[PDB]
Amino acid sequence: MLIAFEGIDGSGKTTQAKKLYEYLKQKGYFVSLYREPGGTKVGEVLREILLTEELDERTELLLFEASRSKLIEEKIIPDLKRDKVVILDRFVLSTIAYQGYGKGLDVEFIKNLNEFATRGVKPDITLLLDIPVDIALRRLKEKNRFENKEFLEKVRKGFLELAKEEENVVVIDASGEEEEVFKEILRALSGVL
Amino acid sequence: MLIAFEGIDGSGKTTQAKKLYEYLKQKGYFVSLYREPGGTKVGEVLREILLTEELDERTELLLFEASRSKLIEEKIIPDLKRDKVVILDRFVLSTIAYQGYGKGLDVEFIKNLNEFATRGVKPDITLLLDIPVDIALRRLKEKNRFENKEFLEKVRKGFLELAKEEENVVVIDASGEEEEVFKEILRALSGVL
Ligand SMILES: Nc1ncnc2c1ncn2[C@@H]1O[C@H](COP(=O)(O)OP(=O)(O)OP(=O)(O)O)[C@@H](O)[C@H]1O
Ligand SMILES: Nc1ncnc2c1ncn2[C@@H]1O[C@H](COP(=O)(O)OP(=O)(O)OP(=O)(O)O)[C@@H](O)[C@H]1O
Ligand SMILES: Nc1ccn([C@@H]2O[C@H](COP(=O)(O)O)[C@@H](O)[C@H]2O)c(=O)n1
Ligand SMILES: Nc1ccn([C@@H]2O[C@H](COP(=O)(O)O)[C@@H](O)[C@H]2O)c(=O)n1
Ligand SMILES: [Mg+2]
Ligand SMILES: [Mg+2]
Numbered sequence: 001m002l003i004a005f006e007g008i009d010g011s012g013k014t015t016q017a018k019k020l021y022e023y024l025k026q027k028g029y030f031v032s033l034y035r036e037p038g039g040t041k042v043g044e045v046l047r048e049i050l051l052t053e054e055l056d057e058r059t060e061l062l063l064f065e066a067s068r069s070k071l072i073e074e075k076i077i078p079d080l081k082r083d084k085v086v087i088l089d090r091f092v093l094s095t096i097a098y099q100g101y102g103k104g105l106d107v108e109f110i111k112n113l114n115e116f117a118t119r120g121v122k123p124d125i126t127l128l129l130d131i132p133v134d135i136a137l138r139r140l141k142e143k144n145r146f147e148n149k150e151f152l153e154k155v156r157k158g159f160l161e162l163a164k165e166e167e168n169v170v171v172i173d174a175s176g177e178e179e180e181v182f183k184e185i186l187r188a189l190s191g192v193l
Numbered sequence: 194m195l196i197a198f199e200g201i202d203g204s205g206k207t208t209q210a211k212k213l214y215e216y217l218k219q220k221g222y223f224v225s226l227y228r229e230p231g232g233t234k235v236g237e238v239l240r241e242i243l244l245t246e247e248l249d250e251r252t253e254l255l256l257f258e259a260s261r262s263k264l265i266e267e268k269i270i271p272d273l274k275r276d277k278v279v280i281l282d283r284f285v286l287s288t289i290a291y292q293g294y295g296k297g298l299d300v301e302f303i304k305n306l307n308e309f310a311t312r313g314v315k316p317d318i319t320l321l322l323d324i325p326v327d328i329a330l331r332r333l334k335e336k337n338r339f340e341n342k343e344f345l346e347k348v349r350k351g352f353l354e355l356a357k358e359e360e361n362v363v364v365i366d367a368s369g370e371e372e373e374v375f376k377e378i379l380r381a382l383s384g385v386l
Binding site for chain 2: 041042045049053055056058059062063065066069070073074109112113116117119
């Protein structure tokens with residue numbers, strides 16, 4: 001079982017993925033939680049680079065994918081083999097939305113890089129935490145983090161276009177309170193688990 | 194002017210590229226010399242990773258391309274804009290030969306990644322330093338470095354198959370002595386410069 005959380009900065013992915021992890025552990029599933037980029041020794045080095053350095057979008061994309069490739073090969077494929085539930089804080093839709101709809105790289109190209117890095121491993125379900133950018137920005141403000149409204153609007157649209165066309169994507173209203181959003185996620189999850 | 198040296202380990206790329214650099218500087222060209230992977234701050238971090246860590250071939254390929262993307266955007270494109278002669282110690286044929294023919298990844302795929310990382314920037318000439326693996330291994334032995342014969346035989350064949358099909362590739366007999374090889378390179382170079 002592979003569960004992917006996707007969405008803009010401040011949509012509650014980290015929080016909700018952690019909530020889903022504890023909940024499922026208590027219910028007796030063997031669970032892993034990983035973030036992208038990151039999740040491996042090598043992946044975390046690349047994460048530090050992606051956050052530290054001034055990078056063009058192409059170099060950026062290739063490093064996101066490298067982190068994913070390492071994570072898929074080192075952790076996710078074996079995790080899935082042992083019937084672990086695998087929960088991802090960001091995955092392949094994030095790459096398309098940010099690098100494609102956001103920074104203007106070719107979407108078919110991103111998709112083929114995604115296919116390559118994941119060896120065609122796809123989620124059973126993707127949870128799109130959709131939220132107005134204004135609301136996501138106010139939440140980040142409370143944590144002293146400031147993101148680009150213009151850029152996130154395009155990204156958000158991207159994410160929503162991808163949910164119409166890509167398979168097994170459920171749009172969750174992430175604008176609610178923490179517990180409301182979690183119980184919307186559980187209903188979407190009841191579909192598959 | 195973009196000049197690329199390609200070929201197996203111990204073929205004399207580093208030595209000949211450095212020789213070509215000093216020669217052209219003396220003749221009054223403005224010259225850059227860069228290695229792949231490496232050549233930028235970020236590229237060299239990735240280099241250290243690629244030489245340090247146990248990596249699957251997919252992750253490897255994506256990090257080789259990330260380095261290249263950084264080098265293209267940070268150094269090569271602007272170097273070419275200012276009419277510098279740019280000399281590369283390894284470039285895009287090496288990727289195909291090592292990751293494609295060597296480790297079995299798809300060659301069309303590597304070529305499309307190459308296209309992406311370089312923004313379609315192609316060399317004016319590529320110098321393939323071809324050498325028998327037995328001879329390259331004897332040279333590396335003198336420096337206490339030991340590489341995999343079985344792997345390099347495939348890689349060498351790959352390099353040679355690419356020189357037949359890809360554009361502007363000259364096969365230099367790298368088995369000769371240092372000064373003989375340099376003379377052959379200068380002849381090949383007279384074609385374009
Ligand atoms: N339903 C909610 N209502 C209000 N605030 C929330 C809700 N869920 C999470 N938060 C808080 O708002 C912020 C959301 O951040 P979180 O890290 O969960 O989102 P994220 O999508 O992981 O962001 P990023 O991509 O930037 O890491 C946090 O400070 C979190 O504690
Ligand atoms: N023509 C030659 N004959 C004998 N030895 C040589 C010749 N040219 C270079 N060498 C030596 O052989 C080794 C291989 O040269 P060099 O480092 O340039 O090859 P390379 O293709 O860069 O190898 P690598 O990819 O492993 O760095 C060096 O230690 C060098 O001193
Ligand atoms: N495909 C992706 C995924 C994440 N990111 C960025 O990575 C940063 C930190 O990641 P987290 O959201 O996982 O903490 C975010 O600010 C986000 O904008 C990106 O630019 N492209
Ligand atoms: N595409 C590439 C390029 C270099 N390499 C490796 O990089 C290493 C460093 O050698 P250089 O000095 O030629 O960069 C070599 O051991 C070579 O086999 C690889 O595996 N795939
Ligand atoms: Mg987060
Ligand atoms: Mg060398």
